[PDB]
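Objective 1.3, modelling of assemblies. Example input:
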Amino acid sequence: DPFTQFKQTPLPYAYDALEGAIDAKTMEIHYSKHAAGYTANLNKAIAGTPAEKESIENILAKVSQYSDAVRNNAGGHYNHELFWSILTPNKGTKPSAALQKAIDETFGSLDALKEKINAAGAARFGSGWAWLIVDNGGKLQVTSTPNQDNPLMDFTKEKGTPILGIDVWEHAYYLRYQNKRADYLTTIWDVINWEEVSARYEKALK
Amino acid sequence: DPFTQFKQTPLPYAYDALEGAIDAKTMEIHYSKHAAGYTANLNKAIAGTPAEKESIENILAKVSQYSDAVRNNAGGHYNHELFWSILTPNKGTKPSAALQKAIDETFGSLDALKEKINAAGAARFGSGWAWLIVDNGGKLQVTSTPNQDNPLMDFTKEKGTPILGIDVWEHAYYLRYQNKRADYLTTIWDVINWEEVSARYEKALK
Ligand SMILES: [Mn+2]
Ligand SMILES: [Mn+2]
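Predicted structure (tokens):
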């Protein structure tokens, strides 16, 4: 149906494409059950409200005006859409010159950034997300959020434009890693698409 | 070491005893990794604090006064301890007469209570627990809480003594049920120990 307000973007690789870090069964369920549900429930939650014809970014920026169903599903739809875009089967991507310079000046090195994101992801108690965001004015920051909340939402304390998000809900890693969230975090770097992260950085700075 | 403040209680059944409903691998990881970690981290978090020699119920009743590490791990330890006790491989347990009468007057029947708990468990967005409690007026209530929070904590909205708790963190059901939380909740009734729930109800009323 072309007329639904929000749609999932088709995955740009096969479910088994990310097997260097994420099992195929998880990819299938995570995309076709969890993420699909957020999209469908978002379209239902906004129907008949002032969010009905708003962009996802505008819904998130005003999300406290709306129901909890709008918050949770707007978050879930945005977050998962971003997540698929920042994964790739193509090994060896790296930050753009501009992003690498910013990472090095702000954290010291790519390894230092990864360590900070790993720690943020590990420290998120319960369900949530780890993020790299660009704050207003352009500074990179690492944060985490609960459940499907994100850095675009009006009440989130550390606000900014996400350029990388990593899902630390247990559904994202339990089939392959069970309790070992730290091993998921260490391994997922092998499938992070730094070209997409860099494109999002470029767009955030405009 | 007998002198640690908190210890795990061994299970009253084998890891594989609940296979009608919960896989052996989940039982083992859930007990020996997740729950063991809450107990160990609780002991560390209270050390050198005013919680150090308090009973678990007294730590919970003042939990707003302590660190997140105390809150999250005191809840986690309590909740899991209770959980293992309310599971059994012995089929066909039933509520005591006193508990059955209260269930029937409050909910209508045992099926109606199960439906209410199943709905509370499904509606808990993110990680958490569904509960049957005896409130401060001696009445039964069904609730849910986020993360490792529970009805003994001073900041929980619906306070009371838990007599039954069901874990709806994804680690509790993902290996067998994946996204189908509702199927886990339907099935777990097959291994609920209503004799222990009834014992906890009798104690709460005293
Ligand atoms: Mn997810
Ligand atoms: Mn658990």
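The beta strands of chain A are 128-134, 140-146, 161-167.
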